[PDB]
Design a protein around this ligand. Structure first.
Ligand code: A1L0G
Ligand code: A1L0G
Lengths: 484, 484
């Protein structure tokens, strides 16, 4: 009686589990005793959860909150939801109870599912509740009864909604199109093991899952508890034989500061990928110098398209380089830089706002058509067609070869805090530095800065801190540094 | 310097010319001396026209009017436009000068191209003019100079705009998705020869071209001058060895009336496909009876998605059958029937308005965002997602097996003119009949009707005519029958 996605129709289930056929006994997951779960064993768990979910009578586009971090079970669940056309709303179990309630209030989901040993208690009787474990999907409270109206699942049905409360609605067509564009850029082979560090609620986690599983590679989820301590993190990457390490730039900060020599011992690491924010070039040069056999890729994009461009950093990074390139749009993606009148910028080195044409475009903001119409706008170079572009909120300029350079959020003398942080990171004893004019440093600095920086770039205040504070998703917490 | 579509990005060029690689010497076209043009020779002409077009400096999404009927040269041109991301506006050379001017006024194209021996004179100096022939593309007036801004072609770039002045904007992604859905329904093999009868300006022509060329089959364009006379039309189908015959129901009307015995001699015809309007069941039963080895397929859909469903008619058609089924949506398509409150109709045999979820959805109506927002509407079963559906303007009901039945335009006792026309087509001496209560017949009838029809279905007037008048696209011209 449940609709199931057909194999020919774009859908995360068929896309991520194709390797269960061509390579059933190859590893889909490596976890830590180092264990592997094969593609066949993963499809078996997905099919079991999907048989259980199908009993609940949910209609296509009924929303399932998945509270978990990246685990074989949580990935088995989101793929079960995918086959049944039930958009998942991934929520980290670290999300505060209040923030979760606010998501439940707006998203009005039919079902909330967490791990057997999950800790969430606060869930209204309108929302069904279930727990999943290699034991199976276990319904605690059934979702409330309904009449199914959707006969067939399509490409534009929602795969997932990302909540930060702003909800980015992504279709199977959009996310599969992104995975296919990256498969074309041979970032990954089937023999790779991708260490993934992002919270499940961050699309960087969904990007890592699909890149691994869509390629026939193994995923190595790094638990936050392993990530937070430098020797522990390095022993986890060594033990699991990780070949690729994905994370926001901050994942390296403790290892660079405390354990650079053990970091150099990661001889199986072939590739590093970051996204989310600028990697401070002094830390990035330090990292590159320790792992000279690891390709480093600058990943640019936003939740609204999942991603835009993948750009290998120069080897070595020029000492004098001020900004890494964010390169060229993925195959099938296109950028217009438009000025403050909405006109194309053709001039080398002049910033405009990125307007992205992407096959991975979000459907809209959940229950916010006004916000949707401000962001997903009529193509300003062809406004009579009804074609839309993403008005990204990001500034960029091109260089002489047409490559892009990120130039900050349009809404956040032009100060480049990156140049302030660079000069400070070049001062004896400073391991980290964030500017917002206040500079915060992890450990005279003022005169060292003034020896090369213009007057408007010299910090008014330089504040010693034990660490750079991070958001749940691992980005610099500038709100937090503001408070103190 | 011209952007060209990449092979990995949905685009009519790569989709229709893949057979130039796997089967270069197989026929792409059969024309009438019976000649063939191979896939390789077709790609050569496409590449030549595209090299010439690229010289003109047009930007991606610059519009090219193609005035032609279905010919190897006109198909070579629309595929050249496709590779360069130049949406084509196909216009039949039968279109009156006034109607063309009205299209030029709204669409403001950069270029108008016609055949060497084309007859159009009326084209403003703002629009470039060119003529194409196996000689090459020949520029008469260059388009006016411009700066190119688009770096890369994407999936959602416009393939073509259909004008009837209402302009349906179709993307490469939408039209390729439709061709792929039909390739999955093995309508056609590479050994087939598809006789196509629609004017190039009608998307039925574009449907036929892509089905043939995307499959590696041969296209057999039927010129209007061959189509208009019954023995001439049958000799053309015989000489070219057509294996499939596509056209609106009216293409059969003269052959059924004048040459039924020669029609039975079409021994190579394996398949017939119609769309656009109801096939009057008495003519359809007559046709099916003459070619018992031809599968007949009822094709339902609209320009806004190119198509929706393909449904093989029963063999034989039950004598008592009142309506052919329009079956089930193509793989990856989904229909909701919604009532006059906007609520799902689940009841067998109750009509509602078709809301279509389609991967082949139009981008919008050219320079008409108001009309777009009335037709491409928020999914009424999931309106907070920003997902849209086509509000089709078509009524339908389901039968016991969930199959659809077309029940007329929402805007056009409920009279079923089909039942009035049926009873008249069953009266001795009537070969055709159209009701609009007035009935028009091609050659006491009133009492024959009253012997089985309810009072409200009995024509007030029965008018003998020499023929049923047709639109350019070959549909019944009810406006025309109204005048007289
Ligand atoms: N390649 C790649 C790739 C792979 C996985 C997931 C993603 C993104 N969804 C990650 C992300 O932070 N998205 S965001 O919407 O929260 O915030 C997006 C914003 O974060 C900033 N950003 C994102 N990438 C950045 C980069 N490489 N350098 C500098 N800033 C970058 C930009 O402002 C951007 O609009 C990209
Ligand atoms: N399968 C298939 C297939 C292949 C090629 C091209 C097409 C359509 N684009 C043809 C067409 O007439 N489109 S229309 O937009 O002008 O007018 C559409 C309208 O014409 C009517 N229509 C279209 N198909 C019909 C059918 N099979 N039976 C009855 N009516 C039908 C409906 O009202 C529909 O909304 C369909």
């Amino acid at each position: 009686r449940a609709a199931r996605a057909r194999e020919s129709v774009d859908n995360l289930y068929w896309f991520m589990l194709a390797a269960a056929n061509s390579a059933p006994d190859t590893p889909a997951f490596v976890t830590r005793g180092v264990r592997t779960l094969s593609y066949r064993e993963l499809r078996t768990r997905v099919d079991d959860f999907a048989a259980a979910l199908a009993e609940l009578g949910l209609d296509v586009d009924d929303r399932v909150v998945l509270e978990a971090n990246v685990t074989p079970d949580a990935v088995a669940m989101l793929l079960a939801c995918s086959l049944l056309g039930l958009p998942f709303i991934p929520v980290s179990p670290e999300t505060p109870s209040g923030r979760l309630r606010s998501i439940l209030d707006t998203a009005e989901p039919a079902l909330f599912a967490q791990a057997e040993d999950g800790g969430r208690a606060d869930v209204p009787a309108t929302v069904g509740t279930a727990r999943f474990g290699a034991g199976g999907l276990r319904v605690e409270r059934a979702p409330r009864a309904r009449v199914r109206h959707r006969r067939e699942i399509v490409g534009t049905d929602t795969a997932y909604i990302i909540f930060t409360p702003k909800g980015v609605v992504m279709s199977h067509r959009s996310v599969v199109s992104l995975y296919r564009a990256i498969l074309e850029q041979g970032l990954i082979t089937p023999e790779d093991r991708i260490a993934t560090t992002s919270p499940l609620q961050f699309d960087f986690a969904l990007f890592d899952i699909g890149l691994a599983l869509g390629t026939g590679a193994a995923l190595v989820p790094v638990p936050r508890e392993e990530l937070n301590w430098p020797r522990r993190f390095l022993a986890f990457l060594g033990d699991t034989g990780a070949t690729q390490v994905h994370g926001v730039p901050s994942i390296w900060r403790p290892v660079l500061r405390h354990e650079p020599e053990l970091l150099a011992g990661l001889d199986r690491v072939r590739g590093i990928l970051f996204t989310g924010e600028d990697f401070p070039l002094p830390e990035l040069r330090h990292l590159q110098g320790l792992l000279p056999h690891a390709r480093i890729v600058n990943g640019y994009g936003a939740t609204e398209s999942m991603a835009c461009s993948l750009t290998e950093v120069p080897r070595p990074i020029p000492s004098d380089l001020e900004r890494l390139s964010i390169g060229f749009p993925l195959p099938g993606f296109d950028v217009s830089l438009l000025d403050e009148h909405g006109r194309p910028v053709e001039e080398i080195g002049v910033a405009g706002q990125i307007h992205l044409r992407a096959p991975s475009m979000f459907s809209g903001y959940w229950d916010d058509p006004e916000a949707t119409a401000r962001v997903l706008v009529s193509d300003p170079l062809d406004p009579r067609s009804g074609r839309t572009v993403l008005r990204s909120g990001d500034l960029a300029y091109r260089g002489e070869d047409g490559e892009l350079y990120f130039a900050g959020r349009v809404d956040a003398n032009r100060v480049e805090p990156g140049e302030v942080e660079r000069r400070l990171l070049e001062f004896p004893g400073i391991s980290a530095a964030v500017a917002l004019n206040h500079a915060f440093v992890v450990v005279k600095a003022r005169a060292f800065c003034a020896d090369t920086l213009p007057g408007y770039m010299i910090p008014a205040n330089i504040v010693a801190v034990d660490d750079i504070p991070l958001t749940v998703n691992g980005k610099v917490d500038r709100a937090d540094l503001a408070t103190r």
